[PDB]
Design a protein around this ligand. Sequence first.
Ligand code: CA
Ligand code: CA
Lengths: 129, 123
Amino acid sequence: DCSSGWSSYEGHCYKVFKQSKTWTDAESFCTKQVNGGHLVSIESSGEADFVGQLIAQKIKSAKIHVWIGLRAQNKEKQCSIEWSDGSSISYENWIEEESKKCLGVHIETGFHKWENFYCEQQDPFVCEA
Amino acid sequence: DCPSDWSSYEGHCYKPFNEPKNWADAENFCTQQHTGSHLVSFQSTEEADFVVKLAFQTFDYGIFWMGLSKIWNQCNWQWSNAAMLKYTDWAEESYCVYFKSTNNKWRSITCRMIANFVCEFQA
Ligand SMILES: [Ca+2]
Ligand SMILES: [Ca+2]
């Protein structure tokens, strides 16, 4: 059983949200929509198919992507320990948006393949409980 | 001192190439150009500006591989609901770092991508 507006699949409840938020705000927002809520987690082919189709029902634009709940915990820009020449990373000059540690799915693959995106980007998302 | 076909800077030798290769092939290629040679590494802003100017004045506009690969492969990837990460469907397996011959800013793209590159070694 799921709250009004939420769709169920294998004992879980899902809901796509059209408002654009950063990965973090989206996650936080989900925790407040329903008890135990979080950004969606895709743990199997079946779930990926269901979530992909659910998303496709509301999102029909290609100018954005949809946030899923997988993210690289590390604060660093990258997790490599050294350059190909062995030297340590003692200097960086990244363009902020180029560090893509949050994942999302895009309409180009029918919302299936996980693509790396800049975490502070604002995009639609899916909550699961 | 660097061979005639390389440019020197702070005791190091650099050389751009315009034979399009993916990251792995570029690195391997660099090692065969001279002993100690690898894809360029940046330890400072001055070195970065040097190499960028070098690449532009030689091939103009283009993207050039940098010596950083599989940048997020060893990161701590976790689902926010604490679920175990088993099933996966990555669009790209690994990301590598490159720069455009127009500025010293680091950019990321899939390591499968085809691009130019710059080799470097200690003289
Ligand atoms: Ca799930
Ligand atoms: Ca260097």
